[PDB]
């Protein structure tokens, strides 16, 4: 029941009447970039990857 609230969820096994049963993939994950190279010594020579792409 996606349209139901968090506290209103009595169970999660099936949709009781109808609708769309969709997986709640967690978008808010706070992915982290770890700097593994010196500022002027990124291995690539043209494009530099300094953050989550």
């Amino acid at each position: 029941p996606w349209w139901n609230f968090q506290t209103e969820h009595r169970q999660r096994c099936v949709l009781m009447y109808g609708g769309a049963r969709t997986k709640n993939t967690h978008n808010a994950n706070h992915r982290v970039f770890i700097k593994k190279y010196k500022r002027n010594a990124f291995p690539n020579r043209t494009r530099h990857h300094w953050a989550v792409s």
Binding site: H30, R31, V32, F33, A51
Partner: protein, 34 residues
């Protein structure tokens, strides 16, 4: 705007988006933008 995308400041993300702007897309009139 997710904070991890591009730089910490939001203007980094906005500048990164501006390179995909349809009006400023690379062509004969606007070339070698970067």
């Amino acid at each position: 705007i997710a904070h991890w995308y591009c730089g910490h400041k939001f203007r980094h993300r906005f500048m990164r988006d501006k390179r995909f702007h349809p009006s400023l897309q690379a062509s004969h009139d606007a070339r070698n933008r970067f």
